[PDB]
Write a protein that binds this DNA or RNA. Structure first.
Length: 85
RNA sequence: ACUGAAACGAUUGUUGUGCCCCUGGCGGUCGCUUUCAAUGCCU
Protein backbone atom coordinates (compact mmCIF):
# COMPACT_ATOMS: atom_id res chain seq x y z
CA UNK A 1 0.00 0.00 0.00
CA UNK A 2 1.43 3.49 -0.88
CA UNK A 3 1.34 5.68 2.29
CA UNK A 4 3.18 8.66 0.72
CA UNK A 5 4.46 8.85 -2.88
CA UNK A 6 5.93 10.95 -5.67
CA UNK A 7 6.96 10.29 -9.27
CA UNK A 8 9.98 11.47 -11.23
CA UNK A 9 9.92 11.17 -15.02
CA UNK A 10 13.58 10.66 -15.99
CA UNK A 11 15.02 9.92 -19.45
CA UNK A 12 17.29 6.91 -20.03
CA UNK A 13 19.54 6.15 -23.07
CA UNK A 14 21.63 3.65 -25.00
CA UNK A 15 25.39 4.36 -24.82
CA UNK A 16 27.48 5.29 -27.86
CA UNK A 17 30.52 3.14 -26.98
CA UNK A 18 32.11 3.76 -30.41
CA UNK A 19 33.52 7.21 -31.28
CA UNK A 20 30.93 7.53 -34.11
CA UNK A 21 27.17 7.37 -33.50
CA UNK A 22 24.29 7.35 -35.99
CA UNK A 23 20.76 7.90 -34.65
CA UNK A 24 18.99 4.84 -36.14
CA UNK A 25 15.20 4.52 -36.42
CA UNK A 26 13.89 1.61 -34.32
CA UNK A 27 13.21 -1.21 -36.78
CA UNK A 28 15.50 0.24 -39.38
CA UNK A 29 18.59 -1.29 -40.82
CA UNK A 30 21.04 -2.42 -38.15
CA UNK A 31 18.16 -1.96 -35.63
CA UNK A 32 15.71 -4.72 -36.75
CA UNK A 33 15.48 -6.52 -33.33
CA UNK A 34 13.80 -5.55 -30.02
CA UNK A 35 16.58 -3.93 -27.89
CA UNK A 36 16.88 -0.57 -26.03
CA UNK A 37 18.43 1.36 -28.92
CA UNK A 38 17.74 5.18 -28.80
CA UNK A 39 16.02 6.63 -25.66
CA UNK A 40 12.96 6.39 -23.36
CA UNK A 41 11.38 8.14 -20.33
CA UNK A 42 10.83 6.21 -17.09
CA UNK A 43 8.17 7.38 -14.62
CA UNK A 44 9.91 6.11 -11.48
CA UNK A 45 8.62 6.11 -7.88
CA UNK A 46 10.83 8.68 -6.12
CA UNK A 47 13.01 8.90 -2.93
CA UNK A 48 10.12 10.93 -1.43
CA UNK A 49 8.01 7.75 -0.90
CA UNK A 50 6.82 5.30 1.77
CA UNK A 51 4.84 2.03 1.34
CA UNK A 52 3.29 -0.46 3.85
CA UNK A 53 3.14 -4.29 3.60
CA UNK A 54 2.59 -7.19 5.94
CA UNK A 55 4.38 -10.51 6.03
CA UNK A 56 2.63 -13.36 7.83
CA UNK A 57 4.64 -16.38 8.78
CA UNK A 58 4.51 -19.34 11.07
CA UNK A 59 7.93 -18.91 12.55
CA UNK A 60 10.03 -16.02 13.83
CA UNK A 61 11.63 -14.54 10.69
CA UNK A 62 15.04 -12.83 10.23
CA UNK A 63 13.77 -10.17 7.77
CA UNK A 64 16.44 -8.14 5.89
CA UNK A 65 16.42 -4.40 6.80
CA UNK A 66 17.37 -3.60 3.18
CA UNK A 67 15.78 -4.93 -0.04
CA UNK A 68 16.15 -4.13 -3.76
CA UNK A 69 13.25 -3.79 -6.27
CA UNK A 70 12.53 -3.33 -9.96
CA UNK A 71 14.14 -2.64 -13.40
CA UNK A 72 17.22 -0.99 -11.81
CA UNK A 73 17.59 -2.94 -8.47
CA UNK A 74 16.82 0.07 -6.26
CA UNK A 75 17.36 0.20 -2.44
CA UNK A 76 14.51 0.19 0.08
CA UNK A 77 14.94 0.56 3.85
CA UNK A 78 12.66 -1.95 5.54
CA UNK A 79 11.87 -1.01 9.12
CA UNK A 80 9.87 -3.80 10.69
CA UNK A 81 7.92 -4.52 13.89
CA UNK A 82 6.27 -7.78 14.90
CA UNK A 83 2.62 -7.03 15.76
CA UNK A 84 2.37 -8.51 19.30
CA UNK A 85 -0.44 -10.92 20.46
C1' A B 1 12.70 -15.44 -14.53
C1' C B 2 11.33 -9.15 -8.62
C1' U B 3 5.41 -5.66 -13.60
C1' G B 4 12.24 -9.71 -14.24
C1' A B 5 17.63 -10.46 -16.80
C1' A B 6 21.74 -5.87 -19.65
C1' A B 7 20.50 -0.22 -19.94
C1' C B 8 25.33 7.37 -20.58
C1' G B 9 19.62 12.47 -22.97
C1' A B 10 24.30 11.60 -25.78
C1' U B 11 27.51 13.93 -29.42
C1' U B 12 29.65 19.27 -30.87
C1' G B 13 30.00 24.32 -29.53
C1' U B 14 34.91 30.82 -27.12
C1' U B 15 29.54 35.24 -23.74
C1' G B 16 31.20 36.67 -28.49
C1' U B 17 32.33 41.05 -31.64
C1' G B 18 34.26 47.11 -31.19
C1' C B 19 35.66 50.62 -27.60
C1' C B 20 41.68 56.13 -25.66
C1' C B 21 39.53 57.19 -18.08
C1' C B 22 38.79 60.75 -21.97
C1' U B 23 38.65 66.48 -22.27
C1' G B 24 41.11 71.41 -19.65
C1' G B 25 44.80 73.16 -16.15
C1' C B 26 51.50 78.09 -15.28
C1' G B 27 53.75 75.05 -8.57
C1' G B 28 51.68 79.99 -8.88
C1' U B 29 52.33 84.61 -6.21
C1' C B 30 55.92 88.46 -3.22
C1' G B 31 61.14 88.75 -1.80
C1' C B 32 68.10 93.78 -2.41
C1' U B 33 72.90 88.24 -0.21
C1' U B 34 71.51 92.38 3.07
C1' U B 35 73.74 95.16 7.37
C1' C B 36 79.47 97.58 9.21
C1' A B 37 84.44 98.09 7.66
C1' A B 38 90.55 103.63 6.41
C1' U B 39 95.27 99.43 2.47
C1' G B 40 96.32 100.82 7.50
C1' C B 41 100.56 101.76 10.92
C1' C B 42 106.66 104.48 10.39
C1' U B 43 110.34 106.25 6.84
Amino acid sequence: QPIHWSYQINTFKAAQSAYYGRSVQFGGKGATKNYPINYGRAKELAVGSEFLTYIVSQKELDLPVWIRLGKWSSKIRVEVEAIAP
